[PDB]
Amino acid sequence: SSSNYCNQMMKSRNLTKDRCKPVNTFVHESLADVQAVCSQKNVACKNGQTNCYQSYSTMSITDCRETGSSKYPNCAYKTTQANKHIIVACEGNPYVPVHFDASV
Amino acid sequence: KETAAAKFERQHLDS
């Protein structure tokens, strides 16, 4: 928990205040552009269900992955920035992203 | 409390 982006944002967003979460992905796009993926390419989710959608374009994403030396309370993350297609599972009305399935 | 859609935004969006 020492000032790279992942350590800072995992703490701020309440993911690592009470545990170290092994992996998390942050999407640097507007909320409505990420919500727009729920009407883009329909694909199967990893679990087999079919309410997943893949973005037509790549999006700016930061992957945060715990190091092999990370132990609560001192969570530590390797930060990887990339531009990738995101795959989200969608539910509700309005039909909105509720789970991040993958980036490709 | 927090809906599933709200949790997705808190955990994964950084606009």
From Swiss-Prot, chain A:
It is found in: Secreted. Belongs to the pancreatic ribonuclease family. It catalyses: an [RNA] containing cytidine + H2O = an [RNA]-3'-cytidine-3'-phosphate + a 5'-hydroxy-ribonucleotide-3'-[RNA]; an [RNA] containing uridine + H2O = an [RNA]-3'-uridine-3'-phosphate + a 5'-hydroxy-ribonucleotide-3'-[RNA]. Glycans are attached at N14, K17, K21. This is Ribonuclease pancreatic. Interacts with and forms tight 1:1 complexes with RNH1. Dimerization of two such complexes may occur. Interaction with RNH1 inhibits this protein. Monomer. Keywords: Disulfide bond, Endonuclease, Glycation, Glycoprotein, Hydrolase, Lyase, Nuclease, Secreted, Signal. Substrate binds at K21, P22, V23, N24, T25, K46, R65. GO terms for molecular function: lyase activity; nucleic acid binding; ribonuclease A activity; RNA nuclease activity. The chain holds residues 47 to 150 of 150 of the full protein. One of its GO terms (cellular component) is extracellular region. Endonuclease that catalyzes the cleavage of RNA on the 3' side of pyrimidine nucleotides. Acts on single-stranded and double-stranded RNA.
UniProtKB/Swiss-Prot annotation, chain B:
Substrate binds at K7, R10. Glycans are attached at K1, K7. Changing H12A: Loss of activity. It comes from the Eukaryota. It is found in: Secreted. Pancreas. The active site is at H12 (proton acceptor). Belongs to the pancreatic ribonuclease family. Interacts with and forms tight 1:1 complexes with RNH1. Dimerization of two such complexes may occur. Interaction with RNH1 inhibits this protein. Monomer. Endonuclease that catalyzes the cleavage of RNA on the 3' side of pyrimidine nucleotides. Acts on single-stranded and double-stranded RNA. This is Ribonuclease pancreatic. It comes from Bos taurus. The gene is RNASE1.
